[PDB]
Design a protein around this ligand. Structure first.
Ligand code: ZN
Lengths: 120, 48
RNA sequence: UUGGCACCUCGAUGUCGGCUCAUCGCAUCCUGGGGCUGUAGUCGGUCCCAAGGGUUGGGCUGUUCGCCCAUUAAAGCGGUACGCGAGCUGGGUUCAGAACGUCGUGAGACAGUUCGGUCCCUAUCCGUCGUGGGCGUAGGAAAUUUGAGAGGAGCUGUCCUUAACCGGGAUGGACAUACCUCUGGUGUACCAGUUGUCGUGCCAACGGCAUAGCUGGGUAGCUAUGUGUGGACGGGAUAAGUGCUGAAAGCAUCUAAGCAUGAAGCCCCCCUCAAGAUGAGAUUUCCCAACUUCGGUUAUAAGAUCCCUCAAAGAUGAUGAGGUUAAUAGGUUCGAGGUGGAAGCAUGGUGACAUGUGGAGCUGACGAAUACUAAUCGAUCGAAGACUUAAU
RNA sequence: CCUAAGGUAGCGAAAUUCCUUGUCGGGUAAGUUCCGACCCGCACGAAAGGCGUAACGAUUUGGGCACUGUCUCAACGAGAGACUCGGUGAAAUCAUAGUACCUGUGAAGAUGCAGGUUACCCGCGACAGGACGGAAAGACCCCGUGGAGCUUUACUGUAGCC
RNA sequence: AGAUAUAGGUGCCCGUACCGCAAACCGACACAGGUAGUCAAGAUGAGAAUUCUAAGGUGAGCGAGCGAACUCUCGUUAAGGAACUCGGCAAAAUGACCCCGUAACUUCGGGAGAAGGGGUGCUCUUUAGGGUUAACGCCCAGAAGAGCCGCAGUGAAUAGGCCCAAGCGACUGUUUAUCAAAAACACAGGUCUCUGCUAAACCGUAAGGUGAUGUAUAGGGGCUGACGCCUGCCCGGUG
RNA sequence: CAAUGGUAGGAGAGCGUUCUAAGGGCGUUGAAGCAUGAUCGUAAGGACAUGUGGAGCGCUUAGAAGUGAGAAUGCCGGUGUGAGUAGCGAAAGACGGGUGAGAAUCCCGUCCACCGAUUGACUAAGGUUUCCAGAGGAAGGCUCGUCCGCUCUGGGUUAGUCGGGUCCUAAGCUGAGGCCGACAGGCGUAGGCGAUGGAUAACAGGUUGAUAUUCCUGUACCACCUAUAUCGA
RNA sequence: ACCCUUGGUCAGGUUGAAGUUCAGGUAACACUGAAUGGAGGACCGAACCGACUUACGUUGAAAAGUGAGCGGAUGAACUGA
RNA sequence: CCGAUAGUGAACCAGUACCGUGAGGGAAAGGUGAAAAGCACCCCGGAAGGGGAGUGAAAUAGAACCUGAAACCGUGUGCUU
RNA sequence: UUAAGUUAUUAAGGGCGCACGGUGGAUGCCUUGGCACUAGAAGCCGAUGAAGGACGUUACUAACGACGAUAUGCUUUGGGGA
């Protein structure tokens, strides 16, 4: 497990934000150290969604954050509803995977190595 | 704790023998005849 | 050691004791070997050879010394700026305050005590501990190696037997080294109990913050106080010694020629490093054409590298496991070990709570399967073997 | 015999006692410190007070209980710097430097001198034995017919006062 | 002494921005320091303490990695438990409210929170009252019983370690801004002395002042230092 | 033929630098200065050729001096070394969208964090335009910057009642005449100055990018003035 | 540093002086009980003011600081103009 | 007599920046060309900067603008390691 | 083809010479500014409000000079002539 330059309390809160951002935007640019680490956090959550029951929706709420998604024509949705409803039906025959990292150059103000994370 | 003699120009240019940088990987792109880093995306009609 | 001299240093060469880390001498404290004894045995006394290793914890005092207590085979003595303050400490000693005895008309002082009291520096060069790159080793590579030379290790209690020596056994102390199966420590992305308070609209379930809020356990890894191993048996040449044959010297004599014997020491034996050992060694494998203006040159080969996924390796780099003709990491699936009975539901109870469903549910590093995601496409380097002589 | 008079009480090896770690008792396995006693007070002593004293003290000294990584003897974990990469970027110091070692030599303790020994060329992370390493024209010690504050029955004056 | 109740209007100058526990002020800096006063909610509490939040404000003017030594700041540790050290330095341990208990010595006030022990969570029964109100209500407190859970109930945070004996100074207080906080200085009390008022004493050339709008139970100076029991001899020398 | 090592010192002969006199010369067909060269004299030193440079400058004899530098922990300038080294000043951010030549760092959003007897709201002092709106990115900002307390050019502070003066006095400071003193001046009476104190008539709501008990709306109060016995030390 | 004039600040809790009243007791006092009362360079502890210990800092964030503990806190207190 | 480190501290918006509570202390900083004839227009760039074209005897005479030494910092190379 | 021997290629970097550049402000030439004097002439200003200052005035106005609400000047007498 990487430590990412934070303290274990800040490192935990920073991945609960990274994970809820993949669930909402489907695609984010991070650094390549936070991408390798947060793929494990969002993939262990996809299996809670596609597992289905109530006790696994109780364990997804220990990680996701309370954010509302604005759908088309004002039909709001919670980030935990979008994960157990819609991200759990397209990934119902894939056995591992779910996510894709793509490298880019070094960014400008420090040469940190930019990366994109998708859902596959 | 402090230098006893100054450093000559000869001894200064030898220490700097290894203070240099190398070029990047930088292969050519198949989609556009171009240059990109190996294993990264192309910064010109970004393909991979 | 106390001094004699005043040659080095006043535009600064930092005291005493202790701590850390040592290193050398031998005029030997123990252990090894011997001669003499006023040596019966057990213990000794003395002198010779011997520096391989070893050579303790406390009380009192700033102490060094010294005196004690309890041990040990032993509690050696000295040099190294009375070793070591750009390694540490600052208790004594000679900074400013204050006081006692004493001396002085006094300011003050010590022929003496007492309580308090500021130790700076980012390593340039040589040195020395690690770890890389370049060139060389007459073609370019990949492995395996010899060992010139170097560095380690070397300690010795008690008991049983022989029954005091010489002989045989069994077990310890202190030091080294490798390792995590065992007993333990830690274990901040592991499980559980619990308090205050603010939240997810409420109940129930949960999240933030309070040293990781606090408390009870704990996987891998790293670890000692834990678990194993080691200094074994021996050879060569000698020391002080003990001799044999033997004359110089018609006898004697270990010595001059000869010949033996003889130590924890010397050179090996054991353990690591070692062809930059420029004297650059050796084995068995791999690759081996086109073009010239005949001078030589290109790219390519075998081999590597860049870049990327990594850990058993790691400051970096290097070393190792792999890159689709793929199990290298992640995810997924099943496990080992850890926690110790989830949620929901139903029953019992007035209630806090209990029981069942059910060794439940969760679970970071550990063992196996599986190409679902990423190790894509590419690029750089890298040989055609000089002339002398002698044999074929 | 001397003097103006010769130290009373109370305390005493002491914030005072040099000899001295005095002696004896107590406390510890072992007590130069500590407490109780002794009087031989180098050199206590009565308003520069003597002797005693409840309470109070970031006061000094000695001993107990508890408690501990202070220690035997160290091990693991978290974070900041160190370390690699991108940005920005000093200072002290400095005669010129291609800046080994040993035994000598020498202004009598050598990177640089002699005779030997050892060492391919250039980095990076570390440690502090030397460069009599840096910093401050030694504060110790002596010397200037140097300075300054203070003292008095040194000298010479003087404000004041009678 | 003295002297002779509505209706319309008029009202000047200076300050006024912004920072103001702060990057606008004093510290050479957009500097971990200093800077009077007013206001100040909820849960918990004796509280303006503690921990978490409101109104409101802020995210710190270099970052990304990796998770060596060594330095720093923090947490844990088998068995032992001051053997460490000049010295328990540092760390650990104590810590709240309630109840029971508490020694010598004393200046009778103290010593004293002496010491040394026990309790503390939640549920349900029944039980005595005390603020305000016609009652219900609404607040504030107690006692006894029967149970339930955990390793642990001030379940977190904040809140004295105790005792024995000796020296010094009675005590609260003051001091070497920047190496000394003390046994040194103050002190309440004690004593000696000088001073009869335009006082002595002190400042100043003087005039004017302090002393003092005081008057010997007052004022200045020297020594001593609470309180208790006391303070011996010497007037030759110096004043 | 003979002499010629030399510190402290003594003695002699000279070289070069600025300015003056007299004489005679050279210079836009290129003086001085600067740079380079394999030249000359016993030395200090003197020429010549080229390049650059753009207006002055040598020679001879004599005269006069601010007349020659490697050292003073010298003075001033400006450039190294140490060195791509130390540091970058207490504390949490993440992602999305947007703007731009350029974004970890600017603006908007969501979530998360931190203070809350204060990192909140006022207000003295002090500072003096830092305030507001448009625009900018040289330097300043310990990085970046499209941003700013920085630069540019336009703005912003409204009072009979708030605080101060046209009211009072304290400590202190001044003081006609006066008293004292070499000078200068010191002191002091009446009388004045002097808040940190006493006195003193306005409230609520709305409004700007920037001011409000000041502007606007509503409702007030105080002093004076004119129309329609009392005053009093 | 001392002083002069005129202002301001000190959360919360604990102790329980002298005086009084009662009741008892005495020829009368004196006395000893109980309430009441609210003294003090008193006690504990924030704000505030100080500076005993240690670590860190020592080309400091700072030409006297910071972290953790420590002392006073109704007075001979602290602090403004 | 000096000729920009000289000569007044000051040749220049000098008793000025700046420093200090104050008295007071006290700098650095001259030169386009005869004439502004001070580079219209094109090209790269957001701009700065530059390459051409033109003005001029001359533009390294382009506004820090006469000459332009040394220390110092570079790029290319003949011989060398 | 084997043995024995001898010598050369390299340059990561460095050294010396030479060319060409940058920084910098010495040197030369130059002068507005000062330094030392000589001859002549002055040797006081102020309540009729001084020396020295503050604030202002221009068509646009930071700043120096000039000068004052008659303000970047007003009148008169005399030079001078685009
Ligand atoms: Zn492309």
């Amino acid at each position: 497990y990487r430590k990412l330059g934070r303290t274990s309390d800040q490192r935990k809160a920073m991945l609960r934000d990274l994970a809820t951002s993949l669930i909402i935007s489907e695609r984010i640019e991070t650094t390549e150290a936070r991408a390798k680490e947060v793929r494990s956090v969002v993939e262990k959550l996809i299996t809670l969604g596609k597992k289905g029951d109530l006790a696994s929706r109780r364990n997804a709420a220990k990680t996701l954050r309370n954010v509302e998604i604005l759908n088309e024509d004002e039909t709001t949705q919670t980030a935990l509803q979008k994960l157990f409803g819609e991200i759990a039906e397209r990934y119902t025959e894939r056995q591992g995977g779910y996510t894709r990292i793509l490298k880019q150059g070094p960014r400008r103000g420090d040469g940190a190595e930019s990366v994109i994370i998708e859902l596959v | 704790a402090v230098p006893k003699r100054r450093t000559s120009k000869t001894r200064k240019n030898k220490r700097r023998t290894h203070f240099k940088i190398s070029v990047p990987g930088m292969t050519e792109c198949p989609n556009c005849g171009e240059y990109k880093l190996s294993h990264r995306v192309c910064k010109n009609c970004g393909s991979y």
